[PDB]
Amino acid sequence: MEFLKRSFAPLTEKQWQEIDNRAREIFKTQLYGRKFVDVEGPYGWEYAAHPLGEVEVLSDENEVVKWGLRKSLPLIELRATFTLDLWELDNLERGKPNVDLSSLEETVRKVAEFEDEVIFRGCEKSGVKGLLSFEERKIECGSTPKDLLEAIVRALSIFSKDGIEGPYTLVINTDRWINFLKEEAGHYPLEKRVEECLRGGKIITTPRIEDALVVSERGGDFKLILGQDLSIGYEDREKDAVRLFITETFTFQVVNPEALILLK
Amino acid sequence: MEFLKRSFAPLTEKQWQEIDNRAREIFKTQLYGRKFVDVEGPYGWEYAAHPLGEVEVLSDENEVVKWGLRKSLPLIELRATFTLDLWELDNLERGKPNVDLSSLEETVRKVAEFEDEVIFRGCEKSGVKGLLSFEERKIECGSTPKDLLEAIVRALSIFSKDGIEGPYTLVINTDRWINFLKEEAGHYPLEKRVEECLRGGKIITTPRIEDALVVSERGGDFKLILGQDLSIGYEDREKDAVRLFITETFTFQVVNPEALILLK
Amino acid sequence: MEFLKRSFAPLTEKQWQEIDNRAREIFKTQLYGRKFVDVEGPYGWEYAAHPLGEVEVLSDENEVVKWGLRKSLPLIELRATFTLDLWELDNLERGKPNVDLSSLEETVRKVAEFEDEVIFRGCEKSGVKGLLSFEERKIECGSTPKDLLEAIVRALSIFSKDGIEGPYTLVINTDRWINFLKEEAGHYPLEKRVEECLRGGKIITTPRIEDALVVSERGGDFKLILGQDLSIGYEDREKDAVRLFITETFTFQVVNPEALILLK
């Protein structure tokens, strides 16, 4: 929006469109948490904190009037900057079909990594606890495909006792998935054995996790709080090059850890 | 069209039709690039160059008035000739069901090879760079079916980081495909393992490539510029035999090499 | 248009208008070729090459499939820059009737010279051959007004044998015209003798030619290919002064040299 100062950038709508398109593509392919966790919002651009629903009592014990502070999560405000040559975007309206947008891509990837780190590991400063921080819900299993299938069945039994329902999905490191696919036959695809044991579920290979998670997708158990979603705006000129920025505001909340299981 | 001088050939519409039909069949089965790359046009018959969208500056540095030349790709104009006996096409209207059209077939195959060479290797004279010239995007993999599947998964991970989406297709040499199918079981078809790892994609066996390519089919990344598409016209008489020709005008452009991956 | 970034210049419409007006005036008075040669287009801003209608065959002699490259003329892209003080354009809306626009005028004159040089001499780099390069069509004549009239009659006889019709015009260096007017009487204006021998034609005094040309104006024999016509846009700030630029894209083609005659 208006705080992005896009109107003041020496660019045509065509160039803005190309930039936005490439950003969207990289993001859709590089944002992995967005695949498992719900999204609420956007609340922005002014939204500053998400309530937790508790009071920390600061009053002493023998005070007549008891009082405390109501708790919330501060939204994380993200800024990153790109620099694009001008002589090279105007070749777009000169008829060039492929305009170099490399710095955009690099920095987009970096911010995607940032958000995925928050979701998966969290942030102490912000008070966010990541999915991989709920060590209290973890299975110890082997390292073969068969061990993996047994572990998945165990996980679904756990979900059963805890009342957790819904489609299930398995988030794996890419390398471990590849090695599971390589380690044993072959006489029936492993992905099918899995999608069967993972009863109507899916597999999602994610390089930002090392081992694996099993999560239910019924809804409402992991949620990303959105103020200002990812947006690109303008800062200044270089002057032969334009400096833009990408920004966001967000927090993350694990609501029901019972819908989460870690695997070794 | 009119530049083809078909009206001046001592032939009936029946004979023209037979000729055109056989040409179309051979072409549909022998034109392999047409299976992966988009086609724009036809622009012909006068279209002479396709713009690139850049200026090469020829002005010196200290000139007051700066100037350069706007760049483009010249269209390649293709001619080949056939000779057909007359006594042998008139047997068509005499009731013969199978008329010999061998020279047509041979020369059609040759021109198909020509276009496929341009697409795959390119042309220095014309300034076309072929698919197999983007060595900067190449994977080193093994030689077994399992190695192949691992390589395909690696390729799709690459497409993932580069923001490349869409159906995927695997262009292979026929011999290597056959040997992959022969080398190991058997207890589950390899083509299915592939179409699965090649997630909803295809395999296309192409004798004009030696090893393999993986390419996305989302659209707009490889494109063939068409002026005058493949057409047959008339030159002269022999006189007992008619001399015809086949012609085309075309260039080729790889727009987004990120949608391209070479395999060993 | 939009590639000119006029909207991003810290200027009001009044100032843009003054600038454009002065540019147009200087151009109309300083563009001499525009007086004789036809103009086609504008094709821009993406137009990159104008077809010539020929194929250069690169195929060897004994190749089965013959091929070549279709030929064209690259458009020349022209850039020049002006710098205008700000404190001095805002006095326009302060009520000043005469705003200093000298750098504009100088640079406009320079680019006009550039285009006239291309038309008259041509450009080797671009492959343009100028009017004064067709030495094969040249008359040797005297240096007196009477010699000039005889030469004009000879030229029209030539046009006669070559089938060239239409109004005729005589492009002369200014100095030679003046000296012809001074050299002999006087008892009947020379311009009238000329316009008579130059049967219903004209005289156009042009400082970018040294001796003279006679050309027919029937149409279609000399033509200027226009992509982006002359236009002014914005580059940056200085910051107390605004930097603008003037740009064009064009080529030139002599189609029928029979409509052209050079005089000594």
Residue numbers in the entry:
A (entry chain A), B (entry chain A), C (entry chain A): 4 to 267
Give verbatim excerpts from the published study on this entry:
Encapsulin is a kind of protein compartment that exists in a wide variety of bacteria and archaea. Encapsulins are assembled by capsid proteins into an icosahedral shell with a diameter between 24 and 42 nm, which encapsulates native cargo proteins involved in oxidative stress and iron mineralization. The conserved C-terminal extension of native cargo proteins, which is called cargo-loading peptide (CLP), mediates the interaction between the interior surface of encapsulin and cargo protein. Considering their programmability and biocompatibility, encapsulin is a promising platform for the delivery of proteins or small ligands and nanoreactors.
Using single-particle cryo-EM, we determined the structure of T. maritima encapsulin packaged with a heterologous IDM complex. To encapsulate the IDM complex in vivo, six subunits of IDM and encapsulin from T. maritima were constructed into individual operons and coexpressed in the insect cells. The 30 amino acid cargo-loading peptide was fused at the C-terminal of the IDM1 protein. The overall resolution of the encapsulin icosahedral shell was solved at 2.87 Å based on the gold standard Fourier Shell Correlation (FSC) 0.143 threshold. We did notice that there were missing densities at the Gly189 and Ala188 position, which was probably due to the flexibility of the A-loop. In our IDM-loaded encapsulin structure, we have found extra density at the fivefold pore in both icosahedral shells. To test if the extra densities were an image-processing artifact of icosahedral reconstruction along the symmetric axes, we then performed de novo C1 reconstruction and found extra densities at all 12 fivefold pores in the C1 reconstruction. The extra density should thus be authentic structural features of the IDM-loaded encapsulin that might be caused by substrate binding or cell factors copurified from the insect cell.
